Amino acid sequence: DIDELIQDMEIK
Amino acid sequence: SERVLSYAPAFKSFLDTSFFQELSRLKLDVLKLDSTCQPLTVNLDLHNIPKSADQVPLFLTNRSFEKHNNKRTNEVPLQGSIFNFNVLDEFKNLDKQLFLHQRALECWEDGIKDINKCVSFVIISFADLKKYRFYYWLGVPCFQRPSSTVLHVRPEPSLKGLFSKCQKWFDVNYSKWVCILDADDEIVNYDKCIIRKTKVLAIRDTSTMENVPSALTKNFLSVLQYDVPDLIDFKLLIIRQNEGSFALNATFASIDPQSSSSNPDMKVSGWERNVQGKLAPRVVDL
């Protein structure tokens, strides 16, 4: 689930 | 012709396999803890930046964890730290803005005692030793204090002559990020009583982007403005060890300033963008 984790950690 | 100055990312990370190997050793040492924070040092080479890169690389290895006297001539030591989480959920849920903000506040506190110490970096990480996958995120706290301060700039050709003198001054003075002109037009260490009068500042720049200085410039300008609160117009030299140094006629300006004699706030940025150009962690498989 690498792609899912990275998406959840994206900030603004 | 008068522009609001914008900036380029200060560094790009490259963590060598040996860095993650050393991190693995570290984590196994503190397996029973929620997390640990350890000091790092990197020696920046501003003379050998790839022609295709946009800024100085941060090349991290097992040796970054150690107190090696391995610096080569002209290299600039940069201190930082790694904050390693033993649980992936904690890494994920860490409030990244608050965290980088606190790193900025430390740079600020260092910077007001010595302008040359207001720069650092941090790596947050999670090491999955089961899958041998390493998640990390480099942050370089770049701050504007007060958050309202911006800079108006326009090109200044006339100062092209000073560039090679600064280049050499910086080479020799490897621990310094800033220098200024004195009354005799010689380069000297930053001193607030002198720049107040001469109003010429040079910064060791880590970006190679044409006419766009590194975001670390904000750190130095913030300390400058704290030291000389009524400074308005001044000259800013952006010094690079290639042919791309440039000079600016600069003016401090403000957007939505806070009431005078309030505790000035700060605006902080500096998380590194990932493989997709997003503000998100990088991942490496060993």
Curated annotation (Swiss-Prot), chain A:
Post-translational modification note: Acetylation regulates autophagy by controlling ATG8 interaction and lipidation. Deacetylated by histone deacetylase RPD3.
Subcellular compartments: Cytoplasm; Mitochondrion
Superkingdom of source: Eukaryota
Induction conditions: Expression is increased during filamentous growth and controlled by the RSF2 transcription factor.
Complex and partners: Monomer. Also interacts with the 40 amino acid C-terminal region of the E1-like ATG7 enzyme. Also interacts with the ATG12-ATG5 conjugate.
More info: Present with 3610 molecules/cell in log phase SD medium.
Function description: E2 conjugating enzyme required for the cytoplasm to vacuole transport (Cvt) and autophagy. Required for selective autophagic degradation of the nucleus (nucleophagy) as well as for mitophagy which contributes to regulate mitochondrial quantity and quality by eliminating the mitochondria to a basal level to fulfill cellular energy requirements and preventing excess ROS production. Responsible for the E2-like covalent binding of phosphatidylethanolamine to the C-terminal Gly of ATG8.
Swiss-Prot/TrEMBL domain comment: The N-terminal region (residues 1-7) is involved in phosphatidylethanolamine-binding and is required for ATG8-PE conjugation. The flexible region (FR) is required for ATG7-binding.
Family classification: Belongs to the ATG3 family.
Name of the protein in question: Autophagy-related protein 3
Name of the gene this protein is made from: ATG3
Swiss-Prot record, chain B:
Transmembrane segments: none
Compartment(s) where it occurs, according to its Swiss-Prot or TrEMBL record: Cytoplasm; Preautophagosomal structure
Domain notes: The C-terminal 40 residues are required for homodimerization, as well as the interactions with ATG3, ATG8 and ATG12; and the C-terminal 17 residues are required for the ATG8 lipidation.
Complex formation: Homodimer; homodimerization is required for ATP-binding. Also interacts with ATG3.
Similarity comment: Belongs to the ATG7 family.
Protein role: E1-like activating enzyme involved in the 2 ubiquitin-like systems required for cytoplasm to vacuole transport (Cvt) and autophagy. Activates ATG12 for its conjugation with ATG5 and ATG8 for its conjugation with phosphatidylethanolamine. Both systems are needed for the ATG8 association to Cvt vesicles and autophagosomes membranes. Autophagy is essential for maintenance of amino acid levels and protein synthesis under nitrogen starvation.
Record protein name field: Ubiquitin-like modifier-activating enzyme ATG7
Source species of the chain: Saccharomyces cerevisiae (strain ATCC 204508 / S288c)
Region of the whole protein represented: 3 to 288 of 630
